[PDB]
Amino acid sequence: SHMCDAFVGTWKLVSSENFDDYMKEVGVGFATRKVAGMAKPNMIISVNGDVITIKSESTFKNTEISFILGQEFDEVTADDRKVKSTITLDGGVLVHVQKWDGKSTTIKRKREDDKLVVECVMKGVTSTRVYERA
Ligand SMILES: O=C(O)[C@H]1[C@@H]2C=C[C@@]3(CN(CCc4ccccc4)C(=O)[C@@H]13)O2
Numbered sequence: 001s002h003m004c005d006a007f008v009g010t011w012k013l014v015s016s017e018n019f020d021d022y023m024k025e026v027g028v029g030f031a032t033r034k035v036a037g038m039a040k041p042n043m044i045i046s047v048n049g050d051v052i053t054i055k056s057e058s059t060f061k062n063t064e065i066s067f068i069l070g071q072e073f074d075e076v077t078a079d080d081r082k083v084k085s086t087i088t089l090d091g092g093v094l095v096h097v098q099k100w101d102g103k104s105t106t107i108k109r110k111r112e113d114d115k116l117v118v119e120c121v122m123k124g125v126t127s128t129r130v131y132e133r134a
Contacts, residue, residue, distance in 0.1 A: 003069065003089060004047050006111045011043045011131035022120050022127035026105055028079045036060050036078065042134055043116075052087070 016037070023033045041058035053066045061078040067087050075085040075098065083098040094109040108119040118129040 002047065004045065004052055004094070007045045007094065007109065007116065008047055009045060010134040011045070011116050012134040013040045013043070013129060014132045015130045016127070017129075018125065018127040019120070019129065021125050022122055023079070025122035025125040026079070026081075027103075032079055043131060 020033055020037050023036065028036070039058040039060040041056045041060075044053075044055040044057070046053045050068050051066055052069070053064065055064045056062070056078075063078055065073070065075055065085070067073050067085070070086065070088050072084055072086045075083050077083060077098070081098070081100050083100040085096060085098050087094060087096045089095070092110070096107040096109070098105050098107070103122075105120065105122045108121075110117050110119075114133065116131040118131065120127040120129065
């Protein structure tokens with residue numbers, strides 16, 4: 001057993017708070033915000049050796065990232081930002097920083113009870129997204 005055991009699995013979004021304002025702060029346009037905001041993604045987290053893969057599947061977009069902790073990688077976000085991403089473990093919390101155009105946003109994922117809680121921060125705006133096991 002290992003680094004992300006407690007994240008691994010299939011998860012379904014059950015609640016979202018403040019996500020439209022988070023997207024606005026990030027720079028997402030009106031139409032994308034409205035469509036993206038309806039989606040209830042299935043997130044699939046898996047580990048193979050040192051490589052973590054996070055897939056998100058929904059009616060809006062299907063995305064996939066694979067990475068090694070601490071090692072920066074290129075990412076195209078669902079809203080079509082081209083970002084430089086680094087994901088680390090900080091006391092049991094997966095911390096994902098995305099940098100683009102002199103801007104930065106941080107996405108934190110933590111296991112709380114039987115849920116996976118996702119905190120998305122851009123400047124002063126925080127959104128919380130809660131996932132249950134699928
Ligand atoms: O993990 C989350 O809950 C949040 C966090 C911040 C942004 C995303 C990207 N992502 C997958 C692509 C997407 C985007 C918008 C709506 C549906 C699907 C999320 O679901 C968003 O990671």
